[PDB]
Design a protein around this nucleic acid. Structure first.
Ligand SMILES: [Mg+2]
Ligand SMILES: [Mg+2]
Ligand SMILES: [Mg+2]
Ligand SMILES: [Mg+2]
Ligand SMILES: [Mg+2]
Ligand SMILES: [Mg+2]
Ligand SMILES: [Mg+2]
Ligand SMILES: [Mg+2]
Ligand SMILES: [Mg+2]
Ligand SMILES: [Mg+2]
Ligand SMILES: [Mg+2]
Ligand SMILES: [Mg+2]
Ligand SMILES: [Mg+2]
Ligand SMILES: [Mg+2]
Ligand SMILES: [Mg+2]
Ligand SMILES: [Mg+2]
Ligand SMILES: [Mg+2]
Ligand SMILES: [Mg+2]
Ligand SMILES: [Mg+2]
Ligand SMILES: [Mg+2]
Ligand SMILES: [Mg+2]
Ligand SMILES: [Mg+2]
Ligand SMILES: [Mg+2]
Ligand SMILES: [Mg+2]
Ligand SMILES: [Mg+2]
Ligand SMILES: [Mg+2]
Ligand SMILES: [Mg+2]
Lengths: 136, 191, 197, 106, 172
RNA sequence: GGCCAGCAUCAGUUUUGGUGGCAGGAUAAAUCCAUAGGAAUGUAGCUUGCCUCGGUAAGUAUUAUAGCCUGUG
RNA sequence: AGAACUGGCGAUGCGGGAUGAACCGAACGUAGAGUUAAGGUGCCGGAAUACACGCUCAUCAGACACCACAAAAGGUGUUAG
RNA sequence: UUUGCUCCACACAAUAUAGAUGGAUACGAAUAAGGCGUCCUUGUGGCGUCGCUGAACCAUAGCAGGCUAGCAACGGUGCACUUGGCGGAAAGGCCUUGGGUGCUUGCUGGCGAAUUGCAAUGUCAUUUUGCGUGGGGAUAAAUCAUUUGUAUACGACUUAGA
């Protein structure tokens, strides 16, 4: 008989929270939240990923579950220094999310022939799995 | 102007364990248990420890924020209710016709039955709400007593009686007749 | 896309559900709509009750037959919303409508078929949280509809059978996953990883 | 195998029109899976057949075809304008229609 | 009225025999193109000096760029505006990253809260509130508190096709 | 060479993309680098009061075991 | 009901204002292609259920010039001064 | 009333089509919260994990897909049969048993394709009906006229008649 209260554990807008951008010249790139402007705007910066330090509307960006030590209002060079230090990229890269992204980018690059080979393999994989799923 | 967050606390005493999934609240203490459904509200509960629970509103307006406190109150009265309990007292009040009050049972139900009121031949009835019990207060004249773990079921069963006893067609000032709620408190004494 | 699209009414906003259904018809897409009683309308129950009585009083003064007809059933409150979004006095209009079917509940065929949703009419995506809304079933039963209880009954019964269907299915895909795994790390599997599979 | 389709599915939507006046010389086609004018810039030029059936056999078949081509993109969501050899019948609004891959550019 | 730029404008009364080299006056003007800017300039000058455009000249127009466009700033703003029954002075504070963005939302806010269109407003001052604790309007102090964080509850992701096969979720 | 088409090379009109070279401005403003000064939504350190073995807070303290701001180059 | 100047209707279709002599756009040989006006783009209905910042919840909300009405006076609803 | 009707089978003819062209691919509930996996004290429980769209999943190679051989598997699938069971909201469909039989592109062989001439939907769906044959099965009634009056302007209604 301890108490037990749900949670509901949201990603936060906060300095050091990394977001993936969805509109515009950048888009598909990560960046860090430096300052926060209001409930609608924040100041982002993503030097490794190429994206310009800028103001940006939250609804244009999606908050990843990643955070890292960043002083509020830190300039680009500092943001580069910390980011690297925290190895956020490899961390992101390792997530299901980023993998899901890369998977479908790859599907969309397949040559028509490659596409043909994907089928031949699925036939092959299907043959032995169907067996498996049949014996115990 | 939208407040970026305001929050409230809900203290938890040594006998009780509140528990809340979705926004469906259950408080279980020494005197039984009640549950209450906050789904209509949009707050966020948070355990901090076995004696502390925060309730908060993010990016809320006035009417929103202004519902934060009443959430706190409602769950609080569940916690007090499940510990100390609630006791509403009512006295009868009449100027000549003695109002005569008793508890009847048809098809197993328990009704408060009020006869003679202001002379009236008609016989008044109020049901007993489940969870509220009714003692005709001995040692005190024309006092009725409604107890229970839910403030809301006692306070309402109270008000039902007092409203079955409204006076029509008279100067309601001069004719002050009725059954009135005369003191609100707890069951467990010293507290 | 498919020959038939079955839409789960539940959680949708009447006039938005109507507005998209209309277009789809007109463009050749057959549609059946289900659980039309679990449809929503913005505005608290009383508002749409008052609106409904407004509608309720228009009638041909000399002959209340010829006048405007008032269907009380949820599917049909719906159909009304829809029909007004379709040029129903033209042949092309009649045509599009025949591609439509609306149902309170989920009766045979469709209960074993899959149903979809329409995000641009999904209340829980659209209504500002806080705003009050109305459920069709409750609205209709207060203006005459007779069959909320019997639908509720049939649904709860349907809902049981389908909970089994599911449980079975979940059981079987658990196996399927366990197979598709006793076969990961094999050559063919690694090969497909490379190609995005 | 089971698929032999060498075209993209499509839909006879309206004629080109105002509120109150249509122009049967231009038809408006919704091309399955094309959502933006950029997306549809691809099909500009592709040829379109509306394939239909009749009771009198003719050059051998009971199947006739109206031929046309995509000509510009129309509006913001991948709808496309097209002209046909003869304007399409208007009972066809909502009928399917076939878009090909020729003339090719890949 | 648009997306703004801020301009230094400089003008003077036309020269004369007896008064060559007249005094020279400057305004910072918030407009969207230089053509509106110059016009705006003469609008206020004649609210101040004996001049019309007819008898005076523009000497220089230059766009002023924000000094630190990726630094957040707490703006104090002063405005004169006309209502349906009176005219009024007013002070709001805006929090953004350039004066030029600031003026954009001001104009918005005025139109939204007070139904004031562009014709009816006069920006008096726009200046950086150097040290906090001279920030005064609460809807801004709100965003200065230390180690600030907040969720964005009830996520609505935008569907890209009319039907969906799931059922969404507003988690976030 | 009657009827209708496909492609190629062009001409007139038009529509929708890719991409190369330049000009202007505070010879953009920023970022970046250097440098001087600064403060706080005060980073290390220090102090003191509770406190399950160091965590909290309220002091001190301006680069320290984070950083930012402002000017000049 | 009666004057002043211009522009119109009458004598004039065409696009818009659902509808309408006079408003808005624009004045007409037969046609192809392009672009626009005024006015629009949830669906009826061609055209973004487009972007952006606020505001508003009405037990008779509101929704676009001409135009198809509302006033003094009030509100501890809410917003910004 | 000149051999009529019905269900099943193919056959010929017509006829038409609001618009096949790989697959409508089944929990429920919540959204200020959930799905899935796992453990357990089976609970408003512990731990793990996922979302950020179906950009999926499934299917998909062979004369529009011909004729053939082998191997590895014991798997998949089509078809007609047969076992047990489920579904009444419009169930008219779902699951299960067992033998049969075809196909298998799971892998490895032999043969074929041209001249439809550089494109021309290049015809592969499913609707209703008509008429022969022959494999099952079935063997009425309504109306007019007559009649009743619980009915009636006329029709209609309501009775009665081997
Ligand atoms: Mg009275
Ligand atoms: Mg009296
Ligand atoms: Mg500046
Ligand atoms: Mg020709
Ligand atoms: Mg040319
Ligand atoms: Mg260039
Ligand atoms: Mg730091
Ligand atoms: Mg510096
Ligand atoms: Mg005349
Ligand atoms: Mg005219
Ligand atoms: Mg017109
Ligand atoms: Mg009008
Ligand atoms: Mg209509
Ligand atoms: Mg349209
Ligand atoms: Mg757009
Ligand atoms: Mg006006
Ligand atoms: Mg007033
Ligand atoms: Mg007010
Ligand atoms: Mg037809
Ligand atoms: Mg979970
Ligand atoms: Mg589970
Ligand atoms: Mg759990
Ligand atoms: Mg899937
Ligand atoms: Mg084959
Ligand atoms: Mg049906
Ligand atoms: Mg072979
Ligand atoms: Mg026969």
């Amino acid at each position: 008989t301890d108490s037990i209260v749900k949670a509901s554990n949201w990603r936060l807008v906060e300095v050091g929270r990394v977001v993936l951008i969805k509109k515009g010249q950048s888009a598909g790139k990560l960046a860090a939240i430096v300052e926060i402007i209001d409930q609608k705007k924040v100041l982002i910066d993503g030097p490794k990923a190429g994206v310009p330090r800028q103001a940006i509307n939250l609804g244009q960006v999606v908050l990843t579950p990643l955070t890292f030590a960043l002083p509020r209002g830190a300039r680009t060079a500092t943001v580069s220094k910390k980011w690297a230090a925290a190895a956020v990229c490899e961390k992101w890269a390792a997530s299901s999310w980023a993998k899901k992204i890369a998977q479908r980018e790859r599907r969309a690059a397949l040559t028509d022939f490659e596409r043909f080979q994907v089928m031949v393999l699925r036939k092959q994989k299907r043959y032995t799995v169907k067996k498996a799923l049949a014996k115990a | 102007m939208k407040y970026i967050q305001t929050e409230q606390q809900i203290e938890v005493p040594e006998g009780v364990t509140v528990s809340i999934k979705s926004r469906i609240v259950k408080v279980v203490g020494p005197r039984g248990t009640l549950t209450k459904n906050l789904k209509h509200i949009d707050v966020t509960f948070t355990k901090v420890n076995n004696q502390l629970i925060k309730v908060a509103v993010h990016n809320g307006g006035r009417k929103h924020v202004a519902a934060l406190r009443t959430v706190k109150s409602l769950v609080d009265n569940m916690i007090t209710g499940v510990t100390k309990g609630y006791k509403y007292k009512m006295r009868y009040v009449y100027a000549h016709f003695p109002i005569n009050v008793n508890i009847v049972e048809k098809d197993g139900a328990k009704f408060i039955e009020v006869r003679n009121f202001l002379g009236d031949k008609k016989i008044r009835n109020v049901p007993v709400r489940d969870g509220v019990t009714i003692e005709f207060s001995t040692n005190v004249k024309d006092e009725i007593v409604l107890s229970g773990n839910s403030v809301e079921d006692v306070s309402q069963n109270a008000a039902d009686l007092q409203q079955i006893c409204r006076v029509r067609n008279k100067d309601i000032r001069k004719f002050l007749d009725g059954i009135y709620v005369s003191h609100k408190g707890f069951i467990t004494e010293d507290l | 896309v498919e020959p038939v699209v079955v839409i789960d009414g539940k959680g949708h906003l009447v006039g938005r559900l109507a507005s998209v259904v209309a277009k789809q018809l007109l463009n050749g897409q057959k549609i059946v709509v289900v659980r039309a009683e679990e449809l929503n309308i913005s505005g608290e129950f009383f508002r749409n009750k008052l609106k409904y009585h407004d509608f309720l009083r228009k009638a041909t003064a000399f002959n209340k037959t010829r006048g405007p007809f008032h269907f009380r059933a949820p599917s049909r409150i719906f159909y009304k919303a829809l029909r007004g979004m379709v040029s129903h006095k033209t042949a092309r209009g009649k045509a599009a409508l025949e591609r439509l079917k609306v149902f309170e509940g989920i009766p045979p065929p469709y209960d074993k078929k899959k149903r979809v949703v329409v995000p641009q009419a999904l209340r829980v995506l659209r209504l500002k949280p806080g705003r009050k809304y109305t459920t069709l079933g409750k609205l209709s039963t207060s203006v005459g509809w007779k069959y909320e209880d019997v639908v509720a009954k049939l649904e709860a019964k349907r809902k049981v059978s389908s909970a089994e269907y599911y449980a079975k299915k979940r059981a079987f895909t658990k196996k399927v996953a366990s197979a598709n795994a006793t076969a990961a790390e094999s050559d063919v599997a690694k090969q497909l990883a490379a190609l995005g599979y | 195998a089971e698929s032999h389709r060498l075209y993209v599915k499509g839909k006879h939507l309206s004629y080109q029109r105002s509120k109150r006046v249509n122009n049967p010389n231009v038809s408006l086609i919704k091309i399955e899976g094309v959502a933006t004018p950029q997306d549809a810039q691809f099909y500009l030029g592709k040829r379109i057949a509306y394939v239909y059936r009749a009771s009198k056999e003719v050059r051998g078949s009971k199947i006739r075809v109206m031929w046309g081509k995509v000509t510009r993109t129309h509006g913001n969501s991948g709808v496309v304008r097209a002209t046909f050899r003869n304007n399409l019948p208007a009972k066809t609004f909502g009928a399917s229609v076939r878009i090909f891959l020729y003339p090719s550019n890949i | 009225m648009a997306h703004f730029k801020e301009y230094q404008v400089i003008g003077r009364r036309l020269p004369t025999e007896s008064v060559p080299e007249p005094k020279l006056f400057r305004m910072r003007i918030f407009a969207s193109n230089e053509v509106i800017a110059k016009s705006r300039y003469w609008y206020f000058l004649q609210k101040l000096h004996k001049v019309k455009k007819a008898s005076g000249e523009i000497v220089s127009i230059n766009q002023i760029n924000e000094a630190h466009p990726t630094k957040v700033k707490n703006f104090g703003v002063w405005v004169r505006y006309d209502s349906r029954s009176g005219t009024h002075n007013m002070y709001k504070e805006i929090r953004d990253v350039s004066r030029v963005a600031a003026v954009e939302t001001l104009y918005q806010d005025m139109a939204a809260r007070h139904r004031a269109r562009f014709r009816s407003i006069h920006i008096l001052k726009v200046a950086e509130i150097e040290k906090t604790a001279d920030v005064k309007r609460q809807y801004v102090k709100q965003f200065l508190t230390k180690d600030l964080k907040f969720p964005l509850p009830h996520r609505v992701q935008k569907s890209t096709k009319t039907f969906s096969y799931k059922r969404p979720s507003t988690f976030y």
